[PDB]
């Protein structure tokens, strides 16, 4: 028996497939379905994804934004049904896979280290020239 296969099989009914690929260093907006007793609305969250940890269906990505003077990070299940959509706001170029370091960095200092990834921005426009 293939225990790995069965596990993927349970996961498949929840596996999401409508979300743009992104990377650490990218700026990104997550439209997230949140409940606020007793209604549910769409709260946006826009920041740099500084971490993406992979475990198949269990992959989760961590997004950092500065909010009214206080740095906030949130983790999302990449296959959560609570994510309305993900809008790519900026493709930045990182040299490592985890950007924890940006936490102790000033604003302009982060600007320097994560310069725009022209190569994936040219792709961003290449596609979307569609039929």
């Amino acid at each position: 028996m293939n225990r790995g296969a069965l596990i993927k099989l349970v996961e498949s009914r929840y596996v999401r497939t409508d979300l743009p690929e992104f990377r650490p260093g990218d700026t990104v907006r997550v439209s997230y379905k949140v409940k606020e007793g007793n209604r549910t609305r769409i709260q946006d969250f826009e920041g740099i994804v500084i971490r993406i940890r992979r475990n198949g269906f269990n992959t989760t990505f961590t997004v950092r934004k500065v909010s009214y003077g206080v740095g906030v990070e949130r983790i999302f299940p990449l296959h959560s049904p609570l994510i309305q959509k993900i809008d790519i706001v900026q493709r930045g170029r990182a040299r490592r896979a985890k950007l924890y370091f940006i936490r102790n960095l000033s604003d302009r200092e982060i600007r320097r280290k994560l310069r725009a990834d022209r190569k994936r921005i040219d792709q961003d426009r290449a596609a979307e020239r569609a039929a």
């Binding site: 028996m1 225990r3 790995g4 069965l6 596990i7 099989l9 349970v10 996961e11 009914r13 929840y14 379905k33 409940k35 269906f57 269990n58 299940p77 959560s80 049904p81 609570l82």
Partner: protein, 204 residues
């Protein structure tokens, strides 16, 4: 009171009513009944289930004659289920519906020789302020001349784990009968690959 033998497949989590539900996947069915226990013949009730088919190349003659008395292809393991007596000759996941609550017994992971701290959550000793080679030590183990002995059952170091453990009141999250899979919320004893028993719960 219904039971079934299984194999712990692994853990994952699903989503249900916008909630993360940590689940353990058990490959339960199908379990051929091999022998029924009757009060007439044995004094109690039970069904001896069979699980995981086995190469006859390895099944000896005393057991081949045992399986034969049931018309069952040789299987790898047999375990009884007290006070359970189904109607067919086969027991599958279909005896469990979602929302039900189960009791899962498995063989716990084997820590081997385990220190007093890991096994019994003893606080050990200090790591500075003069402690002399006692940082992971049990301390005292008795009194003085009265009683001049150590209690039976005194908690000490020794083998920990690899024992039968049962977890109570586990919710059944889904049943996937075509792949013979049981989704149970929470954690089950022991390692992936290890044998488990899934019973109806004794709680209410």
């Amino acid at each position: 009171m219904k039971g079934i033998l299984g194999v712990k497949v692994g853990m994952t989590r699903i989503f249900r009513d916008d909630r993360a539900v940590p689940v353990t996947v058990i490959l339960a069915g199908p379990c051929p009944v091999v022998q029924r226990r009757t009060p007439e013949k044995d004094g109690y009730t039970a069904v001896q289930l069979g699980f995981l088919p086995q190469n006859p190349k390895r099944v000896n003659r005393p057991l081949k004659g045992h399986f034969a008395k049931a018309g069952v292809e040789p299987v790898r393991i047999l375990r009884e289920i007290r006070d359970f007596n189904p109607e067919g000759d086969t027991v599958t996941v279909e005896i469990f519906k979602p929302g039900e609550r189960v009791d899962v017994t498995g063989t716990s992971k084997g820590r081997g020789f385990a220190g007093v701290m890991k096994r019994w959550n003893f606080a050990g000793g200090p790591d500075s302020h003069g402690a002399h080679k006692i940082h992971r030590h049990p301390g005292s183990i008795g009194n003085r001349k009265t009683p001049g002995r150590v209690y039976k059952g005194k908690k000490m170091a020794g083998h920990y784990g690899a024992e039968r453990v049962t977890v109570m009141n586990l919710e059944v999250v889904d049943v996937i009968p075509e792949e013979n899979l049981l989704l149970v919320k929470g954690a089950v004893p022991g390692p992936n690959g290890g044998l488990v028993i899934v019973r109806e719960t004794k709680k209410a």
